[PDB]
Structure formats: C-alpha cells, structure tokens
Amino acid sequence: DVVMTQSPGTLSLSPGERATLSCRASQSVSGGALAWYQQKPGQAPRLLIYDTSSRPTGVPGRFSGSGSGTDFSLTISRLEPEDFAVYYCQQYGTSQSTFGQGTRLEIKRTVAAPSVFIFPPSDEQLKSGTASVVCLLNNFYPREAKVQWKVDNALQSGNSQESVTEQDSKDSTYSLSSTLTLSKADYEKHKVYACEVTHQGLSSPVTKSFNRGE
Amino acid sequence: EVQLVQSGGEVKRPGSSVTVSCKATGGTFSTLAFNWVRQAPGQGPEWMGGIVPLFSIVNYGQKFQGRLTIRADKSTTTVFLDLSGLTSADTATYYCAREGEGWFGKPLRAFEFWGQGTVITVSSASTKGPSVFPLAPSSKGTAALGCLVKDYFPEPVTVSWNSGALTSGVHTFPAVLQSSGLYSLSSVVTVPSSSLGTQTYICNVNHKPSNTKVDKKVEPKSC
C-alpha cells in the first residue's frame, strides 16, 4: 500500500507570493503517475497536474509540477485569491491508487488573539436534563488554538466537541466554538466552570469562568 | 463539454444497501475508466473502485471487495455504485470521476472530470427538529451573544439574525455530530455592548426536513 505524505500540513502564505507544496511516496512511483488536485469547501476536487508535470486544458499556467521517483512538488508562481484551498497529491502507478492527507493553503495575516466568551447553560435547557456550556473564541489568527475546560479545577476530557469556521473572506481570521456537555445532575454537583484558551496571540492563557447559579 | 450528473442524496439505515448513479454526457464513455471516490466529513478523498464500460472490466479497492459493485450502461452512458452492509463509517459524499484523455486520446488514469457528488448519511435517527437555546450576553466594548441549535437530524439547519437584517459579525459554526446521532451547532454574533439595552436580537432557525422554524429572542440574563 503506497503511502503518500504531504508537507507541510498547513501552508500559510501571502496573496501574490510563490507557493511550493511537497509530496513524498513511501516507494518509487511507477511511470511518473503522480497527480495534484485542488479542493474548495463543498466542491469536488479539481485536477491541476497529471503525470508529474502535465497541465490539463483550462488549468492556469501559474500551476506547475515537478519530481520523479519518491519526491514531487507543486508550484504556484503567484497566489491569486482563488488559490487558497486544500491540495492533495495522488499516486496511481499501482492498481490501488492512494491520496495524500492534504495541505491546507491559507492566507497569512497579522497575529490576532481571540476574544473569548463563556456561556452558561440556559435555565430552559437545564429542564431537559442536559447542560451545554459554550466557549467562543472570536476572530483569531493563526488557526491553531487550545481550549481546555476545567470544572472545579478538574481538567475535562472526552465530554467536549468543537468546530471552526472557514477563514473569513474579509479579515482572514478564524472563530471557534467548543461545547462542554454534562448531565444536569453532574452540572449541579460543581461550582466553577472555566474555559482556558492558549493561542500565539495571547501572552499567557486567558480563562473565562462563571459560578453556577450566580 | 463532459458533464457527470449524479443521483440525489439520501439517508440510509445501517445494514441497508445504497445505489448511486452517474449520468455522463459529452465525452468518451466506454473506453475510459469511471471511478467512485468518497469523502467523509472532515476527511480526505478515498478511491473505492472503477469500471471501464466497454466490457465492464472492474477494479475494486481491497477494503470494499464483497460489498461494492460497479456497473455501467453503454446505451444510457450511466455508471452505478452499489454498496451493501452500510454502517456509519460509510457516511460520506460519493463522487463519480472519469479519467482524462491525453495525447490522441491516451487514457491518463488521473481523475479529470467529476460529478457533483451524492451525500449519503447512514444513521438510525429519525427526522427531528432542533431545540434552540440562548447564549446570553455576559453582564460583565463588544459583547457576544448567540443561539445553540441542538439535537436535530438530518442536516442542515440555517440560521439568520433579525430576519436577515443583521449579518456583520455573525459566525454560524459547522455542525457537530453528537454521540446520540443528532447534530448540534451554534450561531453567534458580536455587537456593541451599548446596544444590549436598546437593540432586540432574534435568531431565526430553520430546519426544513422537520418543517420547523424557531425565532428565539436572545437577551441579557436578568439579575
């Protein structure tokens, strides 16, 4: 099973800059059978390069591919706004083709620390028998952020989920929402609910908290 | 131009089989490979198998052998995927993709033409509208407020604020699938703290599969 490993996981670059994306195969790719695809949210992938270096009709000339053996590259000579997307390589030299895990190519902008907000569960929801506690991280960059939930000083694990917006089309930031879900009985057993946020734009972690029932 | 047009999305129960069709028009059909590729939410594409229609030579990914069938009709230029024994690991968008043609028609193997995708969700859940709970603005500049849209099935829900009048600063997050099999999402907006006493904020939630509309007023919590 040929394994395709792409680098970097996230490539952060400026509009108009040159971009170089890498792919490495765990064994030599037969007949230069290496393709690159671009994918935008909600759309099918689009073939940019096939057989290592050939462009299909309709693909702009700023895209080029090179490589041989186990190491391949996709180069974008200058990044137009439409080129920020996820890119996958694919080997198809064997009878079981495989894709790499993708490189997210996103817009680099000035570091922005998140604004952090914590929301207690509504009294209405508590009647359903469940408590959702929400932490919002608003308009931050870069995308990497760490959110830890602490209940009466105990780090929570296994009982939260999060999701992240697409990079904002006007300001190039991200936002993130993390939800801690507890039974009502567990929620009323504890007092202090806190979300602790670590991010490159914060000089030390930010904690937002509330005391149940106050 | 080559167009690949797929059949519609569906919810399927665990243990069932699903058939997806792909009508290919405008280009070579029988002597090129059509492939099925799927992509689960948040994951990369995965090739499943392919067919060359002329004599229906097929190639199936090893992990799908026994559950996957690929077929083709040459008179109606349509390819089919049949996938049996469905489980939640089969929830994905399924695409048909045709190989490109190169120098004097040479098959390129790379996937040049793609269908629009068919969204298949494998679940035992019944259609269910969301509850809507407020994310109330803190008493303790800029304030954040929102709505938590919880426990619905299937996707999607849409959220607007003040009937569309408020769009600046809104973030409506991707849904998460909870361990109960129901989805949940939040929608938030940041606004001037000075507006909290004078401006009404209402989130308008629509879940078309259950014909549910909810308008929830979100206000600072009293006391």
Q: Is A142 exposed, middle or buried (CB count within 10 Å of its CB: 0-12, 13-18, 19+)?
A: middle
Of B117, B133, B144, the CB nearest to A117: B144
Whole-number Å distance between alpha carbons of A42 and A174:
18
DSSP letter for each residue of B7-54: PPPEEE-TT--EEEEEEEESS--TTS-EEEEEE-TTS--EEEEEEETT
Interchain proximity A121–B146, CB inside 8 Å? no
Interchain proximity B135–A134, CB inside 8 Å? yes
**For this experimental structure, what is the resolution in angstroms?**
1.4
DSSP letter for each residue of A7-43: E-SEEEE-TTS-EEEEEEESSPPGGG-EEEEEE-TTS
Instruction: Domains for chain A: give ranges and CATH numbers.
Output: 1-109 (no CATH), 110-214 (2.60.40.10)
Whole-number Å distance between alpha carbons of A4 and B49:
18
Q: Which candidate, B39, A26, A83, places its Cα nearest to that of A74?
A: A83
User: Are the CB atoms for B171 and B188 separated by under 8 Å?
Assistant: yes
Helix or strand holding residue B6 (H, E)? strand B3-6
Interchain proximity B142–A115, CB inside 8 Å? yes
**What are the residue boundaries of the structural domains of chain B, listed by start?**
1-124, 125-223
Interchain proximity B133–A121, CB inside 8 Å? yes
Which residues, 6 or more positions from A158, have their beta carbon under 8 angstroms from its beta carbon?
none
CA distances from A125 to A156, B25, B149, B201, B202 (A): 21, 52, 11, 19, 18
Whole-number Å distance between alpha carbons of A92 and B61:
13
User: Are the CB atoms for A132 and A121 separated by under 8 Å?
Assistant: yes
Whole-number Å distance between alpha carbons of A86 and A167:
12
| The dihedral sign for the CA sequence A52, A57, A60, A61 | positive
Chain A residues inside the 8 Å CB shell of B175: 163
Chain B interface residues facing chain A, Cβ-Cβ under 8 Å? 44-47, 59, 61-62, 95, 97, 100, 102, 108-112, 114-117, 131, 133-136, 138, 142, 144, 146, 148, 150, 171, 173-176, 178, 184-186, 188, 190
CA B44 to chain centre: 14
SS3 A128: coil
Interchain proximity A138–B131, CB inside 8 Å? no
Strands B10-12 and B118-122: parallel
Q: What is the CATH number of domain B125-223?
A: 2.60.40.10
